Each structure stands twice: as structure tokens, then as C-alpha cells.
Design a protein around this ligand. Structure first.
Ligand SMILES: *[C@H](O)C[N+](C)(C)C
Ligand SMILES: *[C@H](O)C[N+](C)(C)C
Ligand SMILES: [K+]
Ligand SMILES: [K+]
Lengths: 493, 493
């Protein structure tokens, strides 16, 4: 029983103006389980217009952070109260294991709770004094919402990624149009009803589902959208920013990557191996910050890889709703094909499939893929360079720190990295040298809402979460006042 | 007495690779008084390589901010020492009255001193801890230089606008390539000598003078440049960001505007009139933040208007070196033509040229334009919409406060605005309502390095100066560490 909704615009359920709709496919069974509306430019026009009027009213954007925080905590509470519903809907549609989805939904609650406090902190930052060296002038800073924002979220954490954008935008006092991925939109549409139950003012959040080209692209190009927040592939990020440039519209981008996990010899191998599979295979490999390039010190390489491979065999590939399930199907046929082609090309280029590379034997149907390990890698192969976004790991060995650092930085990406070593002095050295936005030490993949997140290089720019997240949605307004009533005395009179 | 320089690359003076030069014109005489090296894509390539090299060395980017602050203070002292040299050069190059150039070169020194302060305080921000909920993980933030940056600065405050970008970039630990405007590059080139004399490591700052498409565009699209800071026209900002989009590289943009000065009945007219003059006619009207749209209350419009022209007539237009000069030529023939066309077009549209609109008849050579006041304006007119960048003021009346805000916000731009009223509670209302990044209360145009500066809407995005400027050049790196030494316990062995 998959919900059936319209678009969420101005607090109402509205059918797309041209009434089109697209299927919702369960990645486990490969067959349609329902539908979602497919918006077009006409609908964006309506949603943005609704966003702008909600911005202009006297019950949201000009109110205090403390006021909006009540709605943010209500949202978190309404999410928690309905966690069972959301977890299940996230588990079908997206395809990640049930145990992954429960942690997702718990995190969207924590995220709204965290940004509620941040909204509250915002008030305490209004009219912050700025010291001037002329007693004639006083100065302070106001922090006001930019206006109407376009939020474009990816399908690997459907509600949670949307939350990372929605929560700071609302905290800041902006109003928003959210466009989730057509691959996994059901929980995001459900969120629309959470907004009504908490009495979020009509138009403050608008949710348009649909194809990127049909719904997303006009959101980005709309002349009354003040800012875009995009999470996605680097390729699409170039397009979004190019589009935003024609109206010189600001943009924050987090664009995935090819992140390295560097493993030195002085490690407890069994623990590090468990992080290594968590860094590449969790979320079915579909992790923007996946540590897909394992760089392991030559001396423990043989032992590491062997411990690695049957840790990998003990991971249970099943239907998402099955107990103990630790790997679901990848999100779509399209993704399925691409990941299998990456595997095929890897071999054709002369790499070895040390393990996997095929559909699991005990799962005839569904876009399932065994956790794949690739060795015999030269840095020239496409599998070393390109983002696979599937449960495939690449292994290479290295001599020393210099080779490790060089190999780890040998990508045009720069999102994250993980370094593993009992020498903490060495851990600090590598962290400083890694050309990335986030470094895990003796772990891989924990993302707390408390701390700043974002990449550099082809992984994008801007920082979300932590005390940076709300700043992306703010107009920093300088206010400078002449308090002397003396003439300026520059001209003559 | 005007220097003949080469490009400043890797600490030494280099002939452009294809060896071109372009003239330096005194805007006051229309005389060619010298020439400047004209760099091309080949020279950009050499400068970027030199900057990358200098970034990888151990004497700059990974040193402390305390260490880099000694250089910034040496630069401030060198500038103050050579104050007379730089002021004379800025005056003859840019056309601005000598007394204005005096304030500009003082401010340059002030900017390097303030950011010396910012560099120092960067050290106390390193490894700032971030409290996590789970005792297993610890977190902190590192603030590291982004890498090699491209700085593209305008001609209206030549050395000062460059400093606004150079000072924080060096503070952050970046290496930079600066491309000043070809209409006014002399002092920026002379800055290369300041760098050698304080011993800045070679390649840390590189100065490429030359034409926009030849030197600027290659810098923007260069694959080893990690970020661009641009100030200039909105039309060019769009093309800059579009180019940056290709490689998804971050930009900051400050793109001028059409800023309103709003004047209510409860004011001292002689004092507000002087600020109105300063906000539109100072820097020969070449102010990115010029308050070029006078909105004056109906009840006092008549008086205000001709007290305005009284003051205006008293403005000494002359050669900038002449004692008492309060208005010099605009920068170039091109700008002179465009400004005249703006005036020509306004009267064809039916506006009144109340005063000025012509070349001053006591000055037969030089790009001199009379301060111009245009009344009988419809908001449909070009001169109400488009940035003139000349000494040209637009005047419109209003009845209500609602109408004033409406008119003030009736623009695609949003850089600055100024509000005049002795009623301060009313001043506070208006400041909150104005869709701009900078509001002046009972004054017009004072920019202190202590306060953040930038616009919204088509005036761009990002904040320079104050405690914001250095952050545009940092990689905010999250570092999170598992300190538990226990299995993750997610995957079964
Ligand atoms: C944490 O690893 C970041 N994501 C978005 C991947 C959860
Ligand atoms: C302050 O007025 C800003 N400018 C750039 C004009 C000096
Ligand atoms: K789906
Ligand atoms: K000049």
C-alpha cells in the first residue's frame, strides 16, 4: 500500500497542470508499485509564485528564528511519531536495507532538532556590533533570509538529503521549492503531509516531483528563485551552475567523488576491514563520499585483502525487508546497467575481479549486485578515475607516506578521505595533506549534523550542516549609521 | 615619471610571451602617457604554474597566520612609506581627484593591517573542536588555504579593490594571480615591487596586466585555478560564473548596482544633500555602490532639489592634480560615450535634464562630464533601470513609506542603499525592508574594512572584508576520529 499524492504547493495537493505521472519501481522486485506526479515548468511557476507570496507574508520570513524553531521541533516530533511509516516507505522505493532506513529516519529527526537550535542561535546573532575606528559611525550585521530557494536532493538518502537542505533553509527564514529525485520521491511527498499536520504556513515548503529536465531545470532557471542548493553528480552540477550563472544566482554544490581510504600497516586488520566495507558497500555502494579506492600498505596487503574478501562474503544480500539484510538492490535498471558496464570495462582494461562482478546467485530478480573487489589496478583505468556509485571497491598498494599521499590526491575530486593508523602523529600528517573537505581517522563514513560537510575540487564547494548550514541561506546585511549630525564636510557649500 | 613595467611573475619581471603592450591614457588629457604589458593565455599558464609551485613550498601556505601576518604588515608599511608615489600614480591613471586618491592609498595600508590581524586570529581557530553526541567519535575543524586563486579587480579604485582580494587571500595562505583592469593598472604593477621589497616568496602573488578576454578569461577557465574572485559589471559576472561552471569552480561576485538613497521630510537638507552628492558624484560617479536613485519625499522635493543643484554647481570640476578638485574626468572615451548616450537616451524618453548633461565648457580636452541631475522620471525609463557609472543622478518623489520601499526595491540589483530620516525607528524599519547587502543610515558610501561587504540579487553574492573576507579563501576541513578501538559492529564477521 504505497501512498498516492499530488504535488505539494501552497499547502494543498495539486495535480500537475499537464496531468502527467511517472512510475515508482521497487528496485527489489523490478516491478512498478505505484506512481508519483511529474511536474513541468508550469508547475514550477505555480510553486515559486506560492513560495514568493509565503515569503512576503508576516508569519514566516520576518519572524524570529525562535518562532520558526517551534515548527522545526514539531516536524522532528511528527517524524519520530511516524517513524515506522517513513522507514518502511524508504526501504521500498530506495532499496537500502531496513536497518539502514531506520537510521536514516532517526537522522532526519535529529537534523530538524539540530537546526531548530540553530534558528534559535540566529536571533542571538542579530545586530551583532562591528567596531569602527571612527566615532562618527556605528555598525552592525543583520542576518536575513535570502528569499525563495530551490533545493535539489539525490535518491540515496531520500528524506535525509532533502532534510539537510530544508532544515537550514527554513531555520534561516527562507521559503523553498524542493525537487527530489524521480528515483525515490515517495517519502519526500509524504513529508508534505507532515508540514500540514504541524501547520507550516502555506507555500513555505513546496514539493515538486518529476524528471530533472522537466521539473528541476526550470526550477534552477526561474528568475524569481534566489538560490539553488544541489546535491548530485559533478556532471549535473556543472549544468546547474551554468544555468544559475545566466542570472548570476548563488549555488552550493556537493558532487560526490572518488574518495580514498588509506590503510597503513600498524592497524588491527579485522576492525579496519569492517570500516572498509562500510565505506564502500553500505547504502548498497551508493555513497557520494564512498571510499571506493583502497590504498593499503604493501606489507599487509595480502593479509588485509584476504580478511577483506570473506568479510565481504558474510554480508547478506537479500530483500530489503528481511532480517539481517545488509545489502539491498541498487536503485534502478539504469544504475544497474552502468555499474555492470563499469565492471565489464574494468576487466577489458585488464583488471582482476578478485570477487563478485555479477548478480547474486540466490536472487534471480531485482537490481541486485554482489559486493565487488578489483585488484591489478593501474591509475589509468576508468574504474580508478570515475565514480561508480555501486558496491565496487578498488585496491592498490603503496610504498610509503609520499606515495600514499600522491595516490590519494590523484583524482580531480575532493570530497572525503579516510586514513587508518595507530600512530596518531602520522594520522595528523595525512589529514593535513589530503585535498578534501572531510577526513575520517580510524573510521569511514560517519556524518554528524554537528560538523561542516562539503567538498573541494570537482566535488563542489560550500559547506552544509554544523554551524555553516544556515549561513548558505542568509543575506549578511551590513548596517552603518552616521550618528554625528555634523556635516560630512567633503564638498564646499 | 610613469613606470615602464613587465608582468610580475614568480618574483621577477617577465616580458609577455607574445610581447604585446597597450597604452596608458591620462583621462584628463586624452594623452598616451605610457604603456603596460598585455598578457595572454600563455602568460596566465606560466603565472598559474608559478603560483602552484609557490603553494607547494614550505614557506607560505602551511606556515602560520602569525608568520604570514608579518608580510602583510610589511606591505602596509611599505605602502605608507611610498604613499606619495602611489597617490600620484593613481590620480594620473584613474582620473580621480588627488584628495580621493589620498584616501584610497591610506585605506590600502589599512586593509593590509586589518587582515594581518585576521591572519593571526586564524591560528586560534585551528583544530576548533566540534562536540558530537557519541563518545566514540571526536571532531574538529581545520581551516586551510584552498590553493591557487584568481583575482580580477576593477579600475574605479584600482589598488584598493585589488587589496580587498589580495590581503585576505594571502592571510588565508593562498597564492594568487591578480588581473587588474586595463583601464588602470599602473599602481597594481607597482605593487609587484612592494612584494619583492618585503620579500614575499616568489609566485605567492603574480600580476598579469592586459585585456579582459586575453588575460582574464584564461585565468577563469584555467584548470589549476581553484577559485575566482571577481568585481565588475553584472553582465561580465554572468560570463565569469558560466565559465567557472565548466569546472564547477567557486566564485565570489560583486557586480555593482543601482542603489537608492531614500530621503524623508524630517531631515536637515544641507547635510543630506551633501551625502546625496557624495553617493552619486564622488569617484567621478564611478561607484559600484553609487546611490544613483534619489527617492525624496514629496513635501520637500522642491527645496531639496534646488539646494541639490546649488551644492552641485559649487563642485570644482578640473584636472585632478589641481588644488580643490572635487570632480575629474571619467576613466575612458568608451565610458564617456556610454554615459553621454545614457543622458541622450533619457531625454529622448522624455526625462528632464535639470542640470548638467553636458561636457563642462571650461574644459575642452579630457573625458569631463558635468554632474547631471535627471528629473521627471518614469520607472519605465532606461536611466532608472541601468547602471550608468557616471556622475548622473535620478530623482523621483514619493508620498508614503510603503511607496518609498517599493520604489527602492524596484530593481534587479541589490548592492547598497541609504536612508535619511531623523526618525530612527523609521530608519530601522526601512533598513530591514531594503533588498540589499549594505544599508547606510543618515549617510552614503562609507566602507570600512571591519564590516562585511557584498550584494544580493543581480549585484552578486559572497561577502568580502570584515571577518568574512578570509573565509572565501579557506578549505573548511572536517576531521572526525574514531577513538574507541572497538569493532563498528555493523557487519557480521
Ligand atoms: C556520510 O557519510 C555522508 N552521507 C551523505 C553519505 C551520508
Ligand atoms: C564603499 O563605498 C565601497 N566602494 C567600493 C565604493 C568603495
Ligand atoms: K523507486
Ligand atoms: K588610465
Amino acid at each position: 500500500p504505497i501512498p498516492a499524492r499530488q504535488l505539494f504547493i501552497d499547502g494543498e495537493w495539486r495535480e500537475p497542470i499537464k496531468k502527467n505521472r511517472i512510475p515508482v519501481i521497487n528496485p527489489s522486485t523490478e516491478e512498478i508499485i505505484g506512481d508519483i506526479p511529474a511536474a513541468t515548468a508550469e508547475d514550477v511557476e505555480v510553486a515559486v509564485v506560492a513560495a514568493r507570496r509565503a515569503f512576503r507574508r508576516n508569519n514566516w520570513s520576518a519572524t524570529s528564528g525562535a518562532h520558526r524553531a517551534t515548527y522545526l521541533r514539531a516536524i522532528a516530533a511528527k517524524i519520530t511519531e511516524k517513524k515506522d511509516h517513513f522507514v518502511k516507505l524508504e526501504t521500498i522505493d530506495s532499496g537500502k536495507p531496513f536497518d539502514e532506513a531506520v537510521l536514516d529516519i532517526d537522522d532526519v529527526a535529529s537534523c530538524f532538532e539540530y537546526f531548530a537550535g540553530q534558528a534559535e542561535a540566529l536571533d542571538g546573532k542579530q545586530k551583532a556590533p562591528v567596531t569602527l575606528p571612527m566615532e562618527r559611525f556605528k555598525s552592525h550585521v543583520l542576518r536575513q533570509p535570502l528569499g525563495v530557494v530551490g533545493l535539489i536532493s539525490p535518491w540515496n538518502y531520500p528524506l535525509l538529503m532533502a532534510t539537510w537542505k530544508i532544515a537550514p533553509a527554513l531555520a534561516a527564514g527562507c521559503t523553498a521549492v524542493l525537487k527530489p529525485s524521480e528515483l525515490a520521491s515517495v517519502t519526500c511527498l509524504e513529508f508534505g503531509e507532515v508540514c500540514n499536520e504541524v501547520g507550516l504556513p502555506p507555500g513555505v515548503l513546496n514539493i515538486l516531483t518529476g524528471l530533472g529536465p522537466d521539473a528541476g531545470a526550470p526550477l534552477v532557471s526561474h528568475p524569481d528563485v534566489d538560490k539553488i542548493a544541489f546535491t548530485g553528480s559533478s556532471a549535473t552540477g556543472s549544468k546547474v551552475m551554468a544555468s544559475a550563472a545566466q542570472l548570476v544566482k548563488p549555488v552550493t554544490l556537493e558532487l560526490g567523488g572518488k574518495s580514498p581510504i588509506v590503510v597503513f600497516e600498524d592497524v588491527d586488520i579485522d576492525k579496519v576491514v569492517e570500516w572498509t566495507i562500510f565505506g564502500c558497500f553500505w547504502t548498497n555502494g551508493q555513497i557520494c563520499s564512498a571510499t571506493s579506492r583502497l590504498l593499503v600498505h604493501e606489507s599487509i596487503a595480502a593479509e588485509f585483502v584476504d580478511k577483506l574478501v570473506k568479510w565481504t562474503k558474510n554480508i547478506k544480500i537479500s530483500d530489503p525487508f528481511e532480517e539481517g539484510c545488509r545489502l539491498g538492490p541498487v536503485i534502478s535498471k539504469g544504475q544497474y546497467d552502468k555499474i555492470m558496464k563499469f565492471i565489464s570495462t574494468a576487466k577489458s582494461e585488464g583488471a582482476t575481479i578478485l570477487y563478485g562482478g555479477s548478480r547474486p546467485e540466490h536472487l534471480k530478480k531485482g537490481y541486485y549486485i554482489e559486493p565487488t573487489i578489483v585488484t591489478d589496478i593501474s591509475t589509468s583505468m576508468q574504474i580508478w578515475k570515475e565514480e561508480v556509485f555501486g558496491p565496487v571497491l578498488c585496491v592498490k598498494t603503496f610504498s610509503s607516506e609520499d606515495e600514499a599521499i600522491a595516490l590519494a590526491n590523484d583524482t580531480e575530486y575532493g570530497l572525503a578521505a579516510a586514513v587508518f593508523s595507530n600512530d596518531l602523529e602520522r594520522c595528523e600528517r595525512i589529514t593535513k595533506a589530503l585535498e578534501v573537505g572531510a577526513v575520517w581517522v580510524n573510521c569511514s563514513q560517519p556524518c554528524f549534523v554537528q560538523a561542516p560537510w562539503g567538498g573541494i575540487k570537482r566535488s563542489g564547494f560550500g559547506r552544509e550542516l554544523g554551524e555553516w548550514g544556515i549561513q548558505n541561506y542568509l543575506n549578511i546585511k551590513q548596517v552603518t549609521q552616521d550618528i554625528s549630525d555634523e556635516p560630512w564636510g567633503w564638498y564646499k557649500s
